[PDB]
């Protein structure tokens, strides 16, 4: 149909376009590379072609698909690995003998090879149905049906034909819909453009616990179900590490991992590691992976795949939420997504803003976060779901004022830090309290108090300790440890202990084991207890030396507690933590008189 007028860089101009929508997907040239229409100048439409071009001729054919860059939502997304332009990566390996994308491959959006078992819904013939309703379900996992087959949004009618229970393939018809005669047939998959968010019934308040399973978050600033999060940091920050832990431990029923332009070895590691390791609520065959789907993309792999990653992933997440699942979406990193834009603004010749990144940055990040939150699912059964977004970014040389980090921080309500100095001693991730806040902290403590722990009371003293520690440390540096008071010495020690035992997730035998809110609470009871009794003791006359040497064993025990597997009496209160409480009491008394 159209004919290539020019290729200047990855940017292609082709005449004989009478139309085309925004960001319309095309297959360009005989090669059949990915593209999207960004703009139209005259009859000539400028289309960026984002798969590497080293050999596209002028006057090669241009085929419009007729709809924007879109995603399929349907059966077999779980335990199936995809790119950001929704090509199954497994399908490519077999055919192509190119494990990664080579230049010029056209592989359909889903797997049309794997038959799936369809069972019929509470909607039988003659019944009205509307988008996001559970028309049926597909068995995908050993424990649960993952993919609840939804009628798509922006479709409606009464069902003339319901296919019976049995096996069918993806392209075969299984549903016929009545509304102005045959409105159309439906297939197992449905399509949606990824620049349109999916519509919900209502959004609902975020105040319900999100257990990410990592001690350091639970202790300092927990997230919420419905959360939005920013995390900075630059290599040796433990972001890959916290993703793997996050996937294993996560209470959410789906986790969607987004690789924005990753090392490739990093993607190779996490893929291998989900079936090698076991889940905490049990998992039969590829345990963790059963709950994990990967969108993975490397650093030179298509600029479209990388740009679309956050939208392909957020659309997936919204679909699981409309299904009635709790989703934890990890994107890593939005900063690598931001580089895809920096590149897009130069090529096109549009004028950018500061740091050579465009101004449209701020809108695009904001749109992604607002589609997240906790909501009541669209569809007649009605369920509760969430999309809680944890989004990684990277500072430009210790500069946190770079447009990407500042923008994400603008939109977020939770900020979790990352300190370079503390990572060097091996404490990554490294969250303090002067580089981090959470608005959810206040409601979240109220909900944890209820469940069992004393957390809110301990949280306040814990915050104070860290806040004083920093200030007191500046005096040690400059003046020396000769200007201190004895209570201030106490604040320094307890603090050093907190730094190691929560923030560090680095091994010494084994990478640290699942620590819940309950575990995390016990650690806090022992550190806070140490501090109170010791200050009383010094106030009331007593040696510093006597008190520190005496705590001794108790300190070794809390350090290593996290390596030991949870439950050692109970999850709730361990016998190992219970006993220390007595030891402090016995010491306090010896010291006083």
């Amino acid at each position: 149909y159209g004919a290539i007028y020019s290729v200047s860089g990855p940017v292609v101009i082709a005449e004989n376009m009478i139309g085309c929508a925004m960001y319309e997907l095309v297959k360009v040239g005989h090669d059949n590379l990915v593209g999207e229409v960004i703009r139209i100048d005259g009859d000539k439409a400028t289309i960026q072609v984002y798969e590497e071009t080293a050999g596209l001729t002028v006057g090669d054919p241009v085929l419009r698909t007729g709809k924007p860059l879109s995603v399929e939502l349907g059966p077999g997304l779980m335990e199936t690995i995809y790119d950001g332009i929704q090509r199954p990566l497994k399908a490519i390996k077999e055919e192509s003998q190119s494990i990664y994308i080579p230049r010029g491959i056209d592989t359909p959006a889903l797997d049309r090879t794997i038959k799936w078992q369809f069972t019929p819904g509470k909607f039988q013939v003659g019944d009205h149905i509307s988008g996001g309703d559970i028309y049926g379900s597909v068995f995908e996992n050993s424990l649960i049906s993952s993919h609840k087959i939804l009628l798509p949004p922006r479709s409606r009618g009464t069902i003339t034909w319901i296919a019976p229970a049995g096996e069918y393939t993806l392209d075969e018809k299984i549903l016929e819909v009545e509304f102005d005669g045959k409105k159309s047939d439906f297939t197992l998959y449905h399509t949606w453009p990824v620049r349109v968010p999916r519509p919900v019934t209502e959004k609902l308040s975020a105040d319900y616990p999100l257990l990410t399973g990592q001690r350091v978050l639970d202790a300092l600033f927990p997230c919420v179900q419905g959360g939005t999060t920013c995390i900075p940091g630059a290599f040796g920050c433990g972001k890959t590490v916290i993703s793997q832990s996050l996937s294993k431990y996560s209470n959410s029923d789906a986790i969607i991992y987004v690789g924005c332009g990753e090392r490739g070895n990093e993607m190779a590691e996490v893929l291998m590691e989900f079936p090698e390791l076991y889940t905490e609520m049990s998992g039969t065959k590829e345990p963790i992976m059963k709950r994990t789907t990967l969108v993975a993309n490397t650093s030179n792999m298509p600029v479209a795949a990388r740009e679309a990653s956050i939208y392909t992933g957020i659309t997936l997440a919204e679909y699981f939420r409309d299904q009635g699942k709790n989703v934890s979406m990890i994107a890593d990193s939005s900063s690598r997504w931001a580089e895809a834009l920096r590149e897009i603004s130069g090529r096109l010749g549009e004028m950018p803003a500061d740091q050579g990144f465009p101004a449209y940055l701020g809108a695009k990040l904001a749109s992604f976060y607002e589609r997240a939150g906790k909501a009541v699912a669209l569809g007649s059964p009605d369920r509760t779901g969430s999309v809680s977004i944890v989004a990684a970014v990277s500072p430009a040389g210790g500069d946190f004022s770079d447009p990407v980090t500042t923008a994400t921080l603008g939109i977020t309500q939770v900020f979790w830090g990352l300190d370079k100095k503390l990572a060097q001693r091996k404490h990554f991730p490294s969250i303090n309290t002067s580089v981090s806040y959470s608005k959810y902290t206040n409601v979240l403590n109220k909900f944890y108090d209820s469940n069992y722990p004393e957390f809110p009371v301990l949280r306040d003293r814990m915050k104070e300790i860290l806040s004083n520690a920093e200030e007191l440390e500046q005096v040690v540096q400059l003046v020396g440890k000769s200007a201190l008071s004895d209570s201030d010495k106490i604040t320094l020690d307890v603090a050093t202990l907190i730094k190691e035992d929560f923030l560090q997730q680095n091994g010494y035998s084994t990478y640290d084991a699942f620590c819940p809110i309950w575990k995390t609470f016990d650690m806090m009871r022992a550190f806070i207890s140490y501090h109170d009794e010791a200050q009383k003791a010094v106030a009331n006359g007593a040696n510093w030396s006597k008190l520190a040497d005496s705590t001794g064993d108790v300190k070794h025990a809390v350090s290593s507690s996290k390596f030991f597997e949870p439950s050692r009496g109970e999850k709730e209160v361990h016998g190992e933590f219970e006993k220390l409480l007595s030891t402090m009491q016995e010491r306090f008394a010896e010291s006083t008189d």
Binding site: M351, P352, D354, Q355, S401
Partner: protein
């Protein structure tokens, strides 16, 4: 007086070290890094207007 001098010299030896080692390179790194970012915003603008 002699005991009094000994106590003061120690506070004084501490300060002479403190200024050189901590303060002076903290001022240097902050001034130069902000100078470099500040000039960048200004230069790119000229290039965009020109383009």
């Amino acid at each position: 007086a002699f005991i009094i001098l000994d106590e003061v010299i120690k506070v004084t030896n501490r300060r002479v070290n403190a200024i050189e080692h901590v303060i002076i390179p903290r001022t240097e790194n902050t001034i130069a890094y902000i100078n470099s970012e500040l000039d960048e915003l200004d230069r790119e603008e000229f290039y965009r207007l020109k383009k």
